[PDB]
Design a protein around this nucleic acid. Structure first.
Ligand SMILES: [Mg+2]
Ligand SMILES: [Mg+2]
Ligand SMILES: [Mg+2]
Ligand SMILES: [Mg+2]
Ligand SMILES: [Mg+2]
Ligand SMILES: [Mg+2]
Ligand SMILES: [Mg+2]
Ligand SMILES: [Mg+2]
Ligand SMILES: [Mg+2]
Ligand SMILES: [Mg+2]
Ligand SMILES: [Mg+2]
Ligand SMILES: [Mg+2]
Ligand SMILES: [Mg+2]
Ligand SMILES: [Mg+2]
Ligand SMILES: [Mg+2]
Ligand SMILES: [Mg+2]
Ligand SMILES: [Mg+2]
Ligand SMILES: [Mg+2]
Ligand SMILES: [Mg+2]
Ligand SMILES: [Mg+2]
Ligand SMILES: [Mg+2]
Ligand SMILES: [Mg+2]
Ligand SMILES: [Mg+2]
Ligand SMILES: [Mg+2]
Ligand SMILES: [Mg+2]
Ligand SMILES: [Mg+2]
Ligand SMILES: [Mg+2]
Ligand SMILES: [Mg+2]
Ligand SMILES: [Mg+2]
Ligand SMILES: [Mg+2]
Ligand SMILES: [Mg+2]
Ligand SMILES: [Mg+2]
Ligand SMILES: [Mg+2]
Ligand SMILES: [Mg+2]
Ligand SMILES: [Mg+2]
Ligand SMILES: [Mg+2]
Ligand SMILES: [Mg+2]
Ligand SMILES: [Mg+2]
Ligand SMILES: [Mg+2]
Ligand SMILES: [Mg+2]
Ligand SMILES: [Mg+2]
Ligand SMILES: [Mg+2]
Ligand SMILES: [Mg+2]
Ligand SMILES: [Mg+2]
Ligand SMILES: [Mg+2]
Ligand SMILES: [Mg+2]
Ligand SMILES: [Mg+2]
Ligand SMILES: [Mg+2]
Ligand SMILES: [Mg+2]
Ligand SMILES: [Mg+2]
Ligand SMILES: [Mg+2]
Ligand SMILES: [Mg+2]
Ligand SMILES: [Mg+2]
Ligand SMILES: [Mg+2]
Ligand SMILES: [Mg+2]
Ligand SMILES: [Mg+2]
Ligand SMILES: [Mg+2]
Ligand SMILES: [Mg+2]
Ligand SMILES: [Mg+2]
Ligand SMILES: [Mg+2]
Ligand SMILES: [Mg+2]
Ligand SMILES: [Mg+2]
Ligand SMILES: [Mg+2]
Ligand SMILES: [Mg+2]
Ligand SMILES: [Mg+2]
Ligand SMILES: [Mg+2]
Ligand SMILES: [Mg+2]
Ligand SMILES: [Mg+2]
Lengths: 393, 46, 122, 240, 159
RNA sequence: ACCAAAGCUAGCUCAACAUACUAAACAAAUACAAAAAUACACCAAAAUAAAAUAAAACAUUCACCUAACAUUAAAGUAUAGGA
RNA sequence: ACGAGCUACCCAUGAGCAGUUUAAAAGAACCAACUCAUCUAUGUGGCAAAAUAGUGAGAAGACUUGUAGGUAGAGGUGAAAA
RNA sequence: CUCGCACACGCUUACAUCAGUAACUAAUAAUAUACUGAUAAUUAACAACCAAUAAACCAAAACAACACUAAAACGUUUAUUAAUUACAUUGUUAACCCAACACAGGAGUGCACCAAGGAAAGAUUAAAAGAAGUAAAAGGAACUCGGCAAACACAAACCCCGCCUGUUUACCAAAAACAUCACCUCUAGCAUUACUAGUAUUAGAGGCAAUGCCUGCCCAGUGACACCAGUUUAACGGCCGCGGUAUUCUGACCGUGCAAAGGUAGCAUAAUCACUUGUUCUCCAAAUAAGGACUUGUAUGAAUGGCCACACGAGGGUUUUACUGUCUCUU
RNA sequence: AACUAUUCCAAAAGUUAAACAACUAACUUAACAUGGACUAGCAAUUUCGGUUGGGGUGACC
């Protein structure tokens, strides 16, 4: 095998001990007396140093096994930044879930009713895009780190403007950065989705289940696809210190108990520091699922059972030019077995809000060919966005 | 082209090349300091 | 040819060179990068109430000086420990083992202001 | 003075790690090798050259891995492949037709019947047919591949005698090894690397090659066309 | 270190030359210290050990100048100490072996005050002597108390 | 008549003696980029002196040339040397 | 012993390159900043121990350039001009 | 008339206010940013200082949609611990630095082309010669080593040498020298500091100079392999005569000597010892110039490369136009 | 000479037979590594006799 250090680098082996230390029954004479190095004298050996009072900062790092929460069962954790190798496949398998192409038809009907549009949709949304992508900064060409959260929030505002027409929307509150811990056991593998998502829309009243019983029973016969060489745990964090407790980021008696929509931004300048669209889909599957599972174990409890009352959660995600829509229905708290009823997920993937954007007029042979602004605009994707925002009322 | 401007001042370079620490890090440097001390120089080093 | 003679001061180098003028550090660098002061490192001035007390910055001229005797460890021994030791040897209660009642201290590490490693500034 | 090599990183990573070129200079700072320096900036991908490497010591058996992607590598001539199995990924040197979304077997197991050889497969030499094409050849068993890693190169297994394999290196020299040593089956990636045409001196500079010297040296005795009988066979088999 | 003439003709070039000893790795057994040291020695060292009939003999039987090694002098200091002490820890289980061994070397036995100073560099010596002289200066309270007790006991005995 | 001129001191030199041989001054700061009170280490080491020159060149050789033993003689003797 | 703060070549780490022409940032083209130093005239104790004026060559590259580091004289460095 | 404001690096009070300047600095004064004295001054929000250990991440910057090849600087999150408590410390002037000078030189970046900065002339006179400019009758290279310089011109052709962009003698040479893509020889079977975290389609030591047609004969010498035989010239290097013959000059043929082979293809009065201003044709009124042929060059010649060629060249030569104070011949 | 590689002898560590014929020798060698040789590389030290109708060539001594 080829070992990966290099001798030159690895901290130098201690100097060969002085010859006077091999002679039995003889006290070597050292410079230890004079408190400094001297040539001609033997090198003193000192006891590992114990400053009888311990200092919080300058002490050695406590070994991991000493912690009260240490356990010998390796628990695989999924946090906000983990990438899954096979994204949606893995997500589904860990979640025990079937995938469905479009969005639920409830949501689409909500989307295609001309009653549900804003005053001028094309106008306002073209403006939201242009604002986010250009106008919101002093600089010529804003980076993504700014313009992704800006555009998501612009759209949230455009939808929030409908609180006038359907005044049930005030039953919601928005939250940022909550600790979420969902532990569950799947096929002898222990999984925990643990961490923070970016932004979370919570509601006072839960969301009506979107799948007819025919779907749920057609779920009973569906076989989970499997990737043989790759273990399903791939890309997670092997972790030996963890807590198993159901934790939604809020304590008891929270006035807005029901997770409604989760928002996942990819705001990073470099490509390699963002998620592949697929991996992102996986991320929101797992996290939506965790958010659901927490609740499901709050209103029912740790016992593993099929659910008489499904829990529904939504998720949206972004490049800032590209959107991922997801609706998840949780039907099952027993994931140990592979053979039962499976949870449901609808994923509308790779929905372009606009094709491209020009921040400076593009000029060819001293004429203006392409003006400043967005190229191509899909009112459809914003319509779906609105739909998901309006799912409560 | 034109010469004589060979000296382009930097304090970091100055003190890394000619400084006290640099003179004490090698036996030869120490002999420099010793010679200057002997001659009674006002400034032993930069 | 730069400057050899003039002393090396924070004013002289690049941005990266900051050398204090010799004031003493009051703290450390914290988590936020912001600086944290430690209330214990900041010297607390101990100032007596001067109002009701009579002494002045100068002395009357007709007031005499005196024969100058530098205080010695001996004189200090005799003004303090000698009367007590003599009193307790004359009564035979003298104990060469424990001198602590006379004010001798075997080791300094217990007390707040120690003399030999000199724990206090002033 | 003294410089420290960039080559210290203890843990294996599939992620590209940053490296410092040193044009021809040893750690003392003098030129050792002439004609090297200042190419494009390069990150380094760690290659696992031990093809058979059981993930956990718990299950020793022959295992199987999936090929995820086949990428260009700046550091070597061959193209490399990202290969994942169990919980782990690693870079391996890609065989000629290896493509993404593929399956590759790693096995230490011998048997009387040999094996039908696919490309990415790694087997002990003893397990292969006697005419097979191999690359990434170990010397002693467990050591890791050294020989035949360059782009488009292939050796060939010649024969099997006395619990030992004799193979033919790309230089057409013969090499004798224990038959317990692993090798990968096929020709290495990027076979046309031979026919690439550097267009201009500039490109050579991009590759980090500084021009030859200008001094004129009269050719000596060493030059000419020497025809030498092919050298005797190297044997890493240690006789008792 | 020296020079030579090439060909040994005095009329040829004169050339710097250095003659280096041939060194070997050999492990030697000390009886008195009961140990095997791995030491670099010459063929000459082995011949002198042979000639003096024991490793421990050779070390005890040779003067400081002839060994030339600081390690030789420390070996010697060690087993000289073990002889002057009659250290029981030599062979803890068998006083038979112990007396048997301490027997043959009885010619070299030297007192203890001498035995710990044998192999010492002037540096090590100065250090050792500095440590034996190490004292925390006596508090003036003590000294003044003793002067006062002297004076009080001579004031009590005079009446 | 300008420019100028004249001093006799500052100190030095060489020896003698001599105890014995790193002066004086240290409050803080000084081996971070010396003079910057305060954080887990590393630290350290040795190898023949050479040549200019003399030999009317230069090739073996070439006193003294940073190794205590002085003085009167033996004696520029025995010896050594491209003798 | 001391020198790579000039310069030769490296290593790290930053920074520049507008307009025009082209499917093209192609060691292409025109031409600034920038870098060089062709030819001439001045100058020749000079503004200058190598410059000034005009004129020229390159100008997304084997390009220019800042900062810190390296290699040392029996050596270094060198697209050889000793 | 236009090199301005700021920061970095550097400099170190040269800055500011009041006063003084007989003399000292300013290459001279007036007076004063630079001489002298006294007294003051730059205040942190900017800048410096400003956590470690594990773990998940194969997926460039280029308006980044997506790609190109030379494969690319720049971080999130999760876990484990991180003294917890107003005000810490330090840089903050300038007309400035490196060039012995208050030097027409050298100096990184961001913004500007003016709103900011500045003054070519101490006063005269209007000689020569010198410098820098503008104009010029008729002519238009007759100048001269050369159209050097100049010009109301800013075009065309042909050779030589190098393929090309590039590099070089800082301060007399920028080139035909070097490098270079390409093509060829040699040397290596391999592991933790170079080569290389590479493995013969690789890496070193060299030659030669892209492409195209080619690269002839020689291993006797000298090398180097093979420790001797033997092998090697894209290793160092070499590649011939005398006599007689077709009526006549020549010599297919003949004789014979010597060599390891006897200079092959090509090209040729050449950047090629001399003879040489070879001979002839073209160009000019006239040419030792230029170009084309002939050509034993008895001293050309094939990777110390030979021959053609595209494009390129501040390389070296030649012609035409045009342009002109180069010149007639100066003003 | 040193140094860098080659080759060899000795040093050092070993290993074998109890050798052969009739009525002591031989062989082995991982990295270091010593003494003495060998062949090369890379080098080190030193020198350019005089006369001459100026030197050089030729000639001479
Ligand atoms: Mg100078
Ligand atoms: Mg100076
Ligand atoms: Mg500073
Ligand atoms: Mg500064
Ligand atoms: Mg603070
Ligand atoms: Mg490489
Ligand atoms: Mg490659
Ligand atoms: Mg080459
Ligand atoms: Mg060359
Ligand atoms: Mg002489
Ligand atoms: Mg003389
Ligand atoms: Mg001489
Ligand atoms: Mg001498
Ligand atoms: Mg003799
Ligand atoms: Mg430098
Ligand atoms: Mg441009
Ligand atoms: Mg160009
Ligand atoms: Mg100019
Ligand atoms: Mg002009
Ligand atoms: Mg110009
Ligand atoms: Mg140009
Ligand atoms: Mg051009
Ligand atoms: Mg340096
Ligand atoms: Mg020399
Ligand atoms: Mg040299
Ligand atoms: Mg160069
Ligand atoms: Mg030359
Ligand atoms: Mg020359
Ligand atoms: Mg100055
Ligand atoms: Mg002033
Ligand atoms: Mg004046
Ligand atoms: Mg300022
Ligand atoms: Mg004037
Ligand atoms: Mg005039
Ligand atoms: Mg004129
Ligand atoms: Mg004119
Ligand atoms: Mg005219
Ligand atoms: Mg003419
Ligand atoms: Mg004429
Ligand atoms: Mg001209
Ligand atoms: Mg012209
Ligand atoms: Mg013209
Ligand atoms: Mg050229
Ligand atoms: Mg020059
Ligand atoms: Mg130059
Ligand atoms: Mg040029
Ligand atoms: Mg020039
Ligand atoms: Mg050339
Ligand atoms: Mg060819
Ligand atoms: Mg050619
Ligand atoms: Mg040939
Ligand atoms: Mg031969
Ligand atoms: Mg031969
Ligand atoms: Mg011809
Ligand atoms: Mg000729
Ligand atoms: Mg010839
Ligand atoms: Mg040749
Ligand atoms: Mg030739
Ligand atoms: Mg071309
Ligand atoms: Mg030309
Ligand atoms: Mg050029
Ligand atoms: Mg040119
Ligand atoms: Mg000599
Ligand atoms: Mg002569
Ligand atoms: Mg002469
Ligand atoms: Mg003559
Ligand atoms: Mg004459
Ligand atoms: Mg002669």
């Amino acid at each position: 095998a080829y070992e990966w250090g290099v001798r030159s680098t690895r901290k130098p082996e201690p100097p060969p001990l002085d010859r006077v230390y091999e002679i039995p029954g003889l006290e070597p004479i050292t410079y230890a007396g004079k408190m400094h190095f001297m040539p001609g004298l033997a090198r003193p050996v000192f006891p590992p140093w114990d400053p009888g009072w311990t200092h919080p900062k300058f002490r050695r790092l406590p070994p991991l096994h000493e912690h009260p929460l240490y356990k010998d069962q390796a628990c695989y954790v999924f946090h906000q930044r983990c990438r899954l190798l096979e994204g949606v496949k893995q997500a589904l398998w860990l979640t025990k879930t079937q995938l469905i192409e479009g969005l639920p038809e409830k949501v689409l009907r909500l989307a295609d009713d001309p009653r549900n549009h804003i005053e001028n949709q094309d106008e306002r949304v073209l403006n939201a895009i242009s604002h986010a992508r250009l106008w919101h900064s002093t600089e010529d060409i804003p980076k993504r780190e700014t313009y992704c959260p800006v555009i998501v929030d612009s759209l949230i505002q455009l939808c929030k403007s409908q609180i006038l027409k359907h005044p049930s929307l005030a039953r919601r509150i928005c939250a940022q950065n909550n600790t979420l811990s969902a532990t569950w056991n799947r096929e002898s593998i222990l999984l925990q989705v643990h961490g923070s998502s970016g932004a979370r829309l919570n509601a006072k009243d839960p969301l009506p289940p979107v799948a007819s019983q025919e779907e749920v029973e057609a779920t009973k016969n569906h076989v989970l696809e499997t990737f043989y060489p790759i273990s399903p745990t791939m890309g997670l964090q092997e972790c030996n210190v963890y807590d198993v407790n159901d934790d939604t980021g809020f304590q008891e008696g929270y006035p807005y108990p029901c997770p409604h929509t989760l928002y996942f931004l990819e705001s990073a300048n470099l490509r390699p520091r963002r998620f592949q669209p697929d991996q992102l889909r996986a991320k929101m599957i797992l996290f939506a699922f965790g958010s659901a599972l927490a609740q499901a174990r709050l209103l029912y409890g740790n016992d593993s059972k099929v659910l008489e009352q499904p829990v529904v959660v939504q998720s949206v995600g972004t490049d800032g030019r590209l959107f991922q829509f997801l609706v998840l229905q949780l039907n099952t708290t027993d994931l140990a077995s592979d053979e039962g009823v499976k949870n449901l997920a609808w994923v509308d993937s790779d929905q372009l809000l606009y094709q491209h954007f020009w921040c400076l007029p593009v000029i060819k042979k001293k004429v203006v060919v392409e003006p400043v602004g967005p190229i191509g605009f899909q009112p459809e994707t914003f319509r779906k966005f609105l739909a998901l925002y309006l799912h409560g009322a | 082209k034109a010469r004589g401007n060979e000296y382009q001042p930097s304090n970091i370079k100055r003190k890394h090349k000619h400084g006290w620490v640099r003179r004490l890090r090698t036996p030869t440097g120490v002999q420099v300091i010793l010679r200057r001390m002997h001659k009674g120089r006002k400034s032993l080093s930069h | 040819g730069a400057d050899r003679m003039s002393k090396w001061t924070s004013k002289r180098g690049p941005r990266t060179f900051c050398k204090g003028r010799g004031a003493k550090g009051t703290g450390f660098h914290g988590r936020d990068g912001k600086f944290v002061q430690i209330k214990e490192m900041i010297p607390e001035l101990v100032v007596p109430e001067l109002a009701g007390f009579k002494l002045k910055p100068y002395v009357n001229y007709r007031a005499p000086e005196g024969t100058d005797t530098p205080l010695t460890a001996k004189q200090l021994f005799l003004e303090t420990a000698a009367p007590a030791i003599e009193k307790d040897f004359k009564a035979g209660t003298f104990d060469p083992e424990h001198l602590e009642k006379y004010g001798f201290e075997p080791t300094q590490e217990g007390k707040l202001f120690q003399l030999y490693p000199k724990n206090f500034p002033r | 003075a003294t410089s420290v090599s960039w080559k210290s990183r203890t843990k294996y990573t599939v992620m590209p790690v940053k490296m410092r070129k040193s044009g021809g200079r040893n750690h003392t700072g003098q030129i050792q090798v002439h004609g090297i320096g200042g190419g494009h900036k390069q990150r380094y991908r760690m290659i696992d050259f031990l093809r058979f490497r059981p993930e956990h010591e718990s299950k020793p058996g022959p295992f199987e891995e999936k090929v995820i992607a086949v990428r260009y590598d700046p550091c070597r001539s061959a193209d490399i492949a990202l290969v994942a199995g169990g919980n782990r990924k690693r870079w391996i040197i890609a065989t000629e037709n290896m493509k993404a979304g593929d399956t590759v077997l790693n096995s230490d197991h011998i048997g009387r019947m040999a094996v039908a050889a696919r490309e990415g497969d790694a087997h002990p030499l003893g397990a292969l047919p006697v005419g097979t094409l191999i690359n990434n050849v170990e010397s002693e068993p467990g050591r890791g591949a050294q020989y035949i890693r360059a782009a488009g190169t292939c050796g060939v297994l010649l024969r099997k005698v006395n619990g030992t394999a004799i193979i033919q290196l790309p230089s057409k020299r013969q090499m004798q090894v224990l038959e317990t040593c692993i090798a990968t089956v096929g020709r290495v990636s990027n076979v046309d690397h031979n026919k690439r045409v550097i267009g201009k001196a500039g490109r050579n500079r991009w590759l980090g090659k500084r021009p030859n010297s200008g001094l004129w040296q009269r050719k000596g005795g060493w030059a000419g066309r020497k025809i030498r009988p092919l050298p005797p066979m190297k044997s890493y088999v240690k006789l008792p | 270190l020296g020079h030579r003439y090439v060909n040994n003709d005095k009329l040829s070039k004169r050339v710097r030359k250095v003659w280096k000893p041939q060194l070997f790795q050999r492990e030697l057994y000390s009886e008195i210290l009961d140990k095997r040291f791995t030491v670099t020695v010459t063929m000459r060292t082995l011949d002198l050990i042979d000639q003096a009939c024991g490793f421990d003999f050779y070390i005890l039987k040779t003067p400081k100048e002839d060994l030339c090694s600081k390690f030789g002098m420390d070996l010697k200091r060690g087993m000289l100490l073990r002889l002057a002490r009659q250290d029981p820890q030599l062979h803890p289980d068998d006083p038979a072996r112990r007396a048997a061994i301490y027997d043959r070397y009885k010619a070299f036995v030297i007192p203890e005050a001498e035995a710990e100073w044998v192999g010492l560099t002037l540096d090590e010596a100065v250090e050792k002597q500095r440590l034996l002289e190490e004292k925390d200066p006596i508090p003036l309270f003590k000294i003044f108390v003793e002067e006062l007790l002297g004076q009080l006991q001579q004031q009590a005995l005079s009446e």
